[PDB]
Amino acid sequence: SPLMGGFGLKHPPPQILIKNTPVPADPPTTFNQSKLNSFITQYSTGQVSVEIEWELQKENSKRWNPEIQYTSNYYKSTSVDFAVNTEGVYSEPRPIGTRYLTRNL
Amino acid sequence: GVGSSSGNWHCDSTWLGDRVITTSTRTWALPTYNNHLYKQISNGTATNDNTYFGYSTPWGYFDFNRFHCHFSPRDWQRLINNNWGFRPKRLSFK
Numbered sequence: 001s002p003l004m005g006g007f008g009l010k011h012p013p014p015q016i017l018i019k020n021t022p023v024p025a026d027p028p029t030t031f032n033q034s035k036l037n038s039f040i041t042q043y044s045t046g047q048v049s050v051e052i053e054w055e056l057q058k059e060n061s062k063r064w065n066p067e068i069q070y071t072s073n074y075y076k077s078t079s080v081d082f083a084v085n086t087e088g089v090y091s092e093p094r095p096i097g098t099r100y101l102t103r104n105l
Numbered sequence: 106g107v108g109s110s111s112g113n114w115h116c117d118s119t120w121l122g123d124r125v126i127t128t129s130t131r132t133w134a135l136p137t138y139n140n141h142l143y144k145q146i147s148n149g150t151a152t153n154d155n156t157y158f159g160y161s162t163p164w165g166y167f168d169f170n171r172f173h174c175h176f177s178p179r180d181w182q183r184l185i186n187n188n189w190g191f192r193p194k195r196l197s198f199k
Binding site for chain 1: 177178179181182186
């Protein structure tokens with residue numbers, strides 16, 4: 001199990017390598033064996049979609065009293081947590097763990 | 106039969122899709138009320154706002170008209186933290 005947390009996979013999601021294909025600038029009109037180092041300055045943009053299906057383990061608990069749940073703070077604040085501020089900057093105010101429900105050992 | 110149970114204890118809550126089935130069993134004790142009599146009961150002028158005329162009966166009655174009769178606090182948390190609404194559909198009483 002990976003030490004910084006998560007799922008250890010023998011065959012994880014493969015690395016997806018992307019590169020702009022080099023587009024040479026105008027080569028000389030006399031042949032030169034040297035590799036071309038004059039390239040058209042270039043960048044690419046696009047959209048990337050990743051869809052992950054997760055399987056869930058539903059809690060089947062006979063605990064009587066209410067559990068601890070992750071909740072947003074009810075009290076007023078200058079900005080909404082996990083939202084943008086007045087400058088458009090999205091921020092994550094705290095690290096949300098995963099362990100809130102309880103099980104017996 | 107005298108020596109055979111007429112029912113089992115059924116306290117549970119099963120969450121299945123868009124339904125939750127709460128079942129609750131309790132032990133009750135019913136005394137004899139009013140010495141088996143119907144009694145006229147009244148209250149006069151007490152202020153006029155609190156006057157009444159009615160009848161006390163020798164009968165008891167079963168009440169389960171509170172949510173905690175059916176939902177454990179954890180079940181209530183499950184309901185209120187995850188659902189925009191709920192409504193009763195059917196009941197069985199034993």
